């Protein structure tokens, strides 16, 4: 379960930390965000290897663009390298759903959904993975453009927790990122183990569980 949304205060990026092999839980302590450069984030959902290998390879290709053109790569052009790569492997069975989230002066704050089908879309709000629908549910019914950084961080966290709870194939912990003019800032790892009870008390929600 991964999401990225755009608002007054830049971009919010939030991801779960669960790796599965069917109904086996492989890990609860996984990074699903690649920090490409101080102003570019990539999110990972789908085949674990496929995401990791090719988003690491994107990292290299972006660095090669800085050396060549003496200029930070655009989000548009970064998303389109991954997009064009993936498109060459179409039919072969690659599996990745990814958001390229970053700030350039030229573009402003920008999000690209790119998936292994070849689909490349600009937008303000994406949720990607088996948990996407659970996340959309909470996010779409609380989103405004005019949220505070603090409230937008919370909504992002609260929208991953939501999907961590219902979707059997999501959970572990929430990783939070904020993307501004000054780049990305990491807003920490939140173990669903302790987050759920702190939120249920404080928010008075999750009334369906006995606690």
């Amino acid at each position: 379960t991964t999401l990225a949304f755009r608002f007054q205060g830049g971009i919010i990026v939030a991801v779960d930390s669960r790796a599965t092999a069917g109904n086996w839980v492989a890990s609860q302590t996984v990074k699903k965000v690649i920090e490409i450069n101080p102003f570019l984030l990539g999110t990972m959902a789908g085949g674990a290897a496929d995401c990791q290998f090719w988003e690491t390879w994107l990292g290299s290709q972006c660095r090669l663009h800085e050396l060549r053109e003496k200029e930070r790569i655009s989000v548009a052009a970064a998303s389109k390298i991954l997009s064009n790569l993936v498109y060459q492997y179409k039919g072969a069975g690659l599996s990745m759903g990814t958001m390229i989230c970053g700030y350039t002066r030229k573009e402003g704050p920008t999000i690209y959904y790119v998936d292994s089908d070849g689909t490349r879309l600009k937008g303000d709000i994406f949720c990607v993975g088996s948990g996407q629908t659970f996340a959309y549910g909470v996010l779409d019914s609380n989103y405004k453009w005019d949220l505070s950084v603090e409230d937008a961080l919370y909504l992002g966290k609260r929208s991953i927790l939501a999907a961590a709870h219902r979707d059997a194939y999501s959970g572990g912990s929430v990783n939070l990122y904020h993307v501004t003019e000054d780049g990305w800032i990491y807003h920490g790892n939140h173990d669903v183990g302790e987050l759920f009870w702190k939120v249920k008390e404080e928010e008075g929600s999750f009334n369906n569980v006995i606690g």
């Binding site: 690491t56 390879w57 990292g59 290299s60 660095r63 090669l64 050396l67 060549r68």
Partner: protein, 242 residues
């Protein structure tokens, strides 16, 4: 004529020797290695005053911890730099680490002898040697701060300091005396500027001469024209003192 990969009676590759001659006609480049960093300086040498001088890029970044200066047929350097950058990034992709300055140099020198007309070995499709020498400079955890000279022969020496281009045999004799093991970065800066001034046709200012360095902390930084201008003014006042 005769083969492009032919031996002279003195046991030397003609095309490689003739190549080193092209490199003597090139603009000067100097390197000085210290325990506080490595400094690269070049003579820009614009052919006309209408030529916008800071479009002359004869010092390039290879990675954050490696930069190189050139001298000779500078156009031949483009594909060498492309190979240096691709190699440094591709090393980073396969091992999650920075390529060693020495290993980077060894990869560039591996292009040098890939010339011929179908020479029985691999598939060296490149008509002639490169007409350009490189001063590759960098830092790594293993061997500290490093300066390397990469010739079109495929050999590459490590130097404490080295000049290439038109002024080199004059400049080299000067570095021989001036260099010691406990130079500061600041000293080596003044020293490069000083030796360029001596061996350049034109009077040395901040338009026809470019400085750069590589430090562990800050990586590889080309000095902008204002910073170099202040170091030329500093040099003149130290020379006018005694």
């Amino acid at each position: 004529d005769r083969g492009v990969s032919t031996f002279s009676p003195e046991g030397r590759l003609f095309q490689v020797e003739y190549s080193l001659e092209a490199i003597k006609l090139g603009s000067t480049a100097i390197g000085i290695a210290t325990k506080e960093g490595v400094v690269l300086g070049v003579e820009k040498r614009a052919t006309s005053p209408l030529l916008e001088s800071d479009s002359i890029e004869k010092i390039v970044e290879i990675d954050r911890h490696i930069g190189c200066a050139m001298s000779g047929l500078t156009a031949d350097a483009r594909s060498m730099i492309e190979h240096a950058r691709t190699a440094a990034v591709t090393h980073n992709l396969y091992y999650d680490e920075d390529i060693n300055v020495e290993s980077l140099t060894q990869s560039v020198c591996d292009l040098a002898l890939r010339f011929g007309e179908g020479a029985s070995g691999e598939e060296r499709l490149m008509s002639r040697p490169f007409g350009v020498a490189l001063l590759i400079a960098g830092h790594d955890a293993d061997d500290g701060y490093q300066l390397f000279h990469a010739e079109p022969s495929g050999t590459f020496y490590r130097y404490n300091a080295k000049a290439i281009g038109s002024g080199s045999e004059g400049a080299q004799a000067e570095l021989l005396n001036e260099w010691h093991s406990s130079l500061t970065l600041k000293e080596a800066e003044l020293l490069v500027l000083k030796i360029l001034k001596q061996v350049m046709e034109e009077k040395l200012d901040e338009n026809n001469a470019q400085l750069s360095c590589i430090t562990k902390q800050d990586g590889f930084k080309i000095y902008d024209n204002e910073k170099t201008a202040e170091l030329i003014k500093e040099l003149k006042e130290k020379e006018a003192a005694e």
